[PDB]
Design a protein around this ligand. Sequence first.
Ligand SMILES: Nc1ncnc2c1ncn2[C@@H]1O[C@H](COP(=O)(O)O)[C@@H](O)[C@H]1O
Ligand SMILES: O=C(O)c1cccc(O)c1O
Length: 536
Amino acid sequence: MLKGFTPWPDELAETYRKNGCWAGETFGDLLRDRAAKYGDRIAITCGNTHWSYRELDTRADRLAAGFQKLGIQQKDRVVVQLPNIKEFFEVIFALFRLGALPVFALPSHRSSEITYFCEFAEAAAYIIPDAYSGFDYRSLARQVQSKLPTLKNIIVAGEAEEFLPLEDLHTEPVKLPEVKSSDVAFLQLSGGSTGLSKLIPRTHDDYIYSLKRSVEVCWLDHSTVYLAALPMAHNYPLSSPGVLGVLYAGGRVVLSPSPSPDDAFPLIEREKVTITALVPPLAMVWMDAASSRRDDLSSLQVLQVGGAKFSAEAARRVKAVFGCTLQQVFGMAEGLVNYTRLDDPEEIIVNTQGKPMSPYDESRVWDDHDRDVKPGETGHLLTRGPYTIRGYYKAEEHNAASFTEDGFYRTGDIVRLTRDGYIVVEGRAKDQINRGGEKVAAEEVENHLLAHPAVHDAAMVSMPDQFLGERSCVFIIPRDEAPKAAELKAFLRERGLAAYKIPDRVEFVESFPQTGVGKVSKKALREAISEKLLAG
Ligand SMILES: Nc1ncnc2c1ncn2[C@@H]1O[C@H](COP(=O)(O)O)[C@@H](O)[C@H]1O
Ligand SMILES: O=C(O)c1cccc(O)c1O
């Protein structure tokens, strides 16, 4: 038992293991296994380089030793902040075999966060690249050390300068400690904003299950060719199905330099990728490029889009722009992940956010009083299952206000279950606009606006107002020449939109504040408009 970990109920645990949900295998067993059923069947691609499963397997073994000689022991936490590169793999499976626990930080993090990540998780090691996307991470490290003189095992992929050169750790394999299929395998990082993040303990059993399923639902096989276009450490592109899921199904993963259609498209054409995943904001740009940039993306088959609702106005265009099957994906690091099945109608794909991936996923839409709302109603989404946590790392306070007494985790999202179980998300309860004592589902108004020839993307945020409590302020990224706020409102009015849903204010910008994985940060936008307001 890892300090801070909250297990599932004894009786419900057995259920899962007995119901073949928990395989009883580790990531060690996983890699050991696959690496031996198809040896040099390419597993990872970066530029011109290639890494056989078997190769990955080896390096892992070797690195594990080097890591162990470094002094890292079972259960030790090791924050890992690497971009989309081959090392990320050897590095995490090596820790997985050592029993160490990675802590998945994103490359966009900095001292404020990394110090917290290190201080909190009581990390025994920090892993970074010499530099990426123009940001030298050793300077960041130097920053963290300054605050954490104790952090003494800084490791670096590429020119390691004064710290520890990741390349020199590999050494002779050795006997490693028994890792139990039920041990916490790593610690993930909770959603973007509300402030500081929460850590998310996952275990070989609960996670790998979330992989085998996703694979089955996404149809991943040896033919699979996934293009990691988002920071892969993020749950979404790490397991839904993500790079790890891909490994599971003996397929091959292609690491892209950045999310830009500039790095991905040529890469898509060249490596002939068949599935990739974008968040909504990035999805718009991908589209815009998929015309104003002819170049063969025909290889593509499935194009995942999650992290936030993919407004109907845009989803409907996948088939036409990328000539493939769109897949809504509404998941979370806490567990539950919903997928529009590659089967079901075009409509279901274009107007819902899917339905749970596991038969054992339980989801209840309660109302402000934890009173199950009526059928098909809109309400607070709670969930519970095989790959859904029962508590955050060391956080008794948050856990009290996030997990019901019976294990249910409230996801803060507001949704309505449909006929077939499929979930149609409205948005985050805290993203709701309580204007003049009226509920305003932002997304709804946004979706309309995307339909305007001069709108590229849009994020409706609420803003203060002493008389109505809150007013509505929409941010618009012009699809060229910034339309007139009056023109947009008139547009909404013509479409028949309810007066109280029309944005009180329109604010034009070139891009929206985002987060680690790249989602728009409505929190951020809120701050923005609130400052402007104060400016007066
Ligand atoms: N497909 C989606 N549609 C609507 N909201 C989503 C979707 N995917 C992810 N999310 C949001 O992202 C959360 C999970 O992690 P985070 O973004 O870190 O708070 C969910 O609870 C949602 O609030
Ligand atoms: O983190 C998320 O919000 C997320 C989005 C899509 C799919 C996932 O698995 C996720 O964890």
